[PDB]
């Protein structure tokens, strides 16, 4: 398929900071913040621009759930160039690096991770990317890293925890701007494997409404994932009605 010597046409996506590489096959690609290297072995595309050699990275939907959301057709992403994004559950640079590419030099990414072993690489990756701030701390206690984070335009949560609703709740109140963005990736099995996936998704949305987050849209990630959905909402402190 997308072999080495193949030639492709790069065009912009509907979302700012995201691109499409056309050909016999289409690829979702983001401009490389740190040219010449791959974070996790993804394919890369070089374009000769007047000349400077700019580079692009391939975004694999089967590895990043945010990428799966783009393929499935999310209407609104608050992640855009020149915005501050608080990334919860940043295991490594598999998805944060691509988010760091979208926000660009002007934006920042606050990557929050708990486990130290994935944390160590997040530090090493962050030093190739000046706009990533790694915060090796538990997301269940935002008070610990309140010094480190300012107000953020969007909050992205990939934490696979049964009480993610409280984690997203606490972080938004401290750091998310009014009318800001919230993006959640919900895996039904982690939250409650006893009940069906549809029940779990309806339950998580109800909790978000209780927390003054107005859901805007919901999307399931098939064929890339099973029993997964991404809920996109807005933080309306004034009122959801």
């Amino acid at each position: 398929g997308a072999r080495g010597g193949a030639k492709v046409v790069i065009e912009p996506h509907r979302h700012a900071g995201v691109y499409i590489a056309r050909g016999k096959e289409d690829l979702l690609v983001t401009k490389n913040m740190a040219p010449g290297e791959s974070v996790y072995g993804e394919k890369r595309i070089s374009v000769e621009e007047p000349p400077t050699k700019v580079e692009y990275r391939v975004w694999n939907p089967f590895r990043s759930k945010l990428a799966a959301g783009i393929m499935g057709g999310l209407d609104e992403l608050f992640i855009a160039p020149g915005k501050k994004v608080l990334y919860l559950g940043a295991a490594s640079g598999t998805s944060v690096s691509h988010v760091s590419d979208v926000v660009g030099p002007e934006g920042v990414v606050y990557a929050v991770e708990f486990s130290h072993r994935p944390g160590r690489e997040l530090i090493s990756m962050a030093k190739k990317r000046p706009n990533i701030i790694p915060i090796i701390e538990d997301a269940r206690h935002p008070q610990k890293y309140r010094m480190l984070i300012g107000m953020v335009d969007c909050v992205f949560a990939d934490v696979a925890q049964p009480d993610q609703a409280r984690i997203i709740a606490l972080n938004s109140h401290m750091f998310l701007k009014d009318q800001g963005g919230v993006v959640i990736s919900i895996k039904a099995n982690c939250i409650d494997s006893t009940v069906d996936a549809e029940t779990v998704f309806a339950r998580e949305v109800q909790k978000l409404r209780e927390e003054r987050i107005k859901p805007l849209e919901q999307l399931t990630l098939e064929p890339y994932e099973r029993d997964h959905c991404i809920v996109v909402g807005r933080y309306m402190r004034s009122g959801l009605k």
Partner: protein, 121 residues
């Protein structure tokens, strides 16, 4: 604090080893560290079982990192001799993986142990 973490207690060790033995009869078990590493790459692992007395322990400490990256449950059992015996081979086994198969006869038994491993983590 110790490198092998979490380590299953006596009650949970037997429950795990039973699933390992049934998986071997059903051809749903991959034995060895190298084979376990491959299955994580393909995303076909329900969970990884490792032996905590491996000499040295570090030769299987890469698997937890791959597991956490892929969000695959993992757990350590005290003995590699016991793990090898349950796996069905005639030699000690330091690491093993339960292959994912939605049409298997031991779905409930696997998912029962899988849930307990998640609580332990």
């Amino acid at each position: 604090n110790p490198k092998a973490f979490p380590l299953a207690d006596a009650a949970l060790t037997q429950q795990i080893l039973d699933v390992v033995q049934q998986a071997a009869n059903l051809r749903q078990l991959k034995k060895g560290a190298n084979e376990a590493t491959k299955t994580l790459n393909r995303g076909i692992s329900e969970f990884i079982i490792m032996a905590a007395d491996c000499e040295p322990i570090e030769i299987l400490l890469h698997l937890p990192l791959l597991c956490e990256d892929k969000n695959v449950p993992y757990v350590f059992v005290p003995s590699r001799v016991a793990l090898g015996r349950a796996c069905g081979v005639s030699r000690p086994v330091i690491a093993a993986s339960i292959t994912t198969n939605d049409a298997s006869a031991i779905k409930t038994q696997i998912y029962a142990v899988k849930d307990k491993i998640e609580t332990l983590l």
